Structure formats: C-alpha cells, structure tokens
C-alpha cells in the first residue's frame, strides 16, 4: 500500500467540505442524502444509514474526516476508482450530450445552493475548458478533478 500524500489530503479535505455543509466536521445521513439526491439518485433512509455504517469506524452514526480519508484511500487503492468521476460528470451534464455547458453548471451550482455570480461561472468554465470550445467535455472534467 501507499501512504496518502499531503496534496491528496488537501484535495480530499476540499471534497469533504462539499458534504459537510454545516462545517461541523461530520457527514450525516442528511448531508449524504442531500448530495446523492442532487446527483439524481433516490436512496432510502435505510440505504443512507447502511452507506455511512460501512465507513463509520467508531459507530457514532456519522463520518468524520479521518474516516473519510480511510474511505478515499480504499477507493484509490481498490482498482483505481473511476466510476465516481463518471457518475459525477453525468450529474452536471443534464441533457446528456457529452458536454457540460455554462448553463448546466450554473443550474447545478444554484441547486446546490451556491448562487454563483456571472463572473464566477465564467471562471469555472474557462479554467476547465482546455480545448476552447466554451464547454467542458469528459476529459476536461477528469483533468479538473483528477488533480495532482
């Protein structure tokens, strides 16, 4: 096995923050469910509890950052993830055409309660848009998330 790098820990801390919307340092079923539903899934409360239980090392019913890190190491360790990123792309690509448009991005962010300004949306698209077509394809999305 390979020990987690400080760059990976930082990336995962940023990922954890997206789930931990109240910043209380834990991810609850409510928080996990909110994210899942936002990605088009329809889990039941029983399913959500089971999902947390799997990674909940201390049995307190929620996921803390250390538990999240163990989970991410496993995801990277087992095979090499990949499905995670594909399903995420599909959430953003609302019309399923293979490209995330600025409108689609803004719609997702607004739904997630992030009322981005026009300038903020433009910056997200410009930075991900390596080929310059004004939208974000799958490879560009992977590169943006893949991170170093």
């Amino acid at each position: 096995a390979d020990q987690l790098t400080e760059e990976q820990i930082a990336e995962f801390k940023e990922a954890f923050s997206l789930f931990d919307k109240d910043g209380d340092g834990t991810i609850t079923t409510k928080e996990l469910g909110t994210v899942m539903r936002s990605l088009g899934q329809n889990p039941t409360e029983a399913e959500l509890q089971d999902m947390i239980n799997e990674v909940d090392a201390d049995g307190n019913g929620t996921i803390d950052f250390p538990e999240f890190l163990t989970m991410m190491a496993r995801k990277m360790k087992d095979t090499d993830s990949e499905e995670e990123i594909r399903e995420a792309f599909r959430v953003f690509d609302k019309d399923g055409n293979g490209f995330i448009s600025a409108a689609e991005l803004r719609h997702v962010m607004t739904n997630l309660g992030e009322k981005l300004t026009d300038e903020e949306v433009d910056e997200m698209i410009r930075e991900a848009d390596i080929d310059g077509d004004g939208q974000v394809n799958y490879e560009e999305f992977v590169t943006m998330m893949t991170a170093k």
Partner: peptide, 26 residues
Amino acid sequence: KRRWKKNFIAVSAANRFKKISSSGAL
C-alpha cells in the same frame, strides 16, 4: 475559486459509496 472539484470530488465520495455495493446480483 471556480473549482468544480470540491463539488465533483464531494459527489464522488457519495457516488462511490453507492457503487461500492459490489453488484447485489444475488
């Protein structure tokens, strides 16, 4: 700043916990 990453990654964590279920085929 405009990192669709924390947003994507985050969803990646949960999305991964949904697929971790190694096909409940049986």
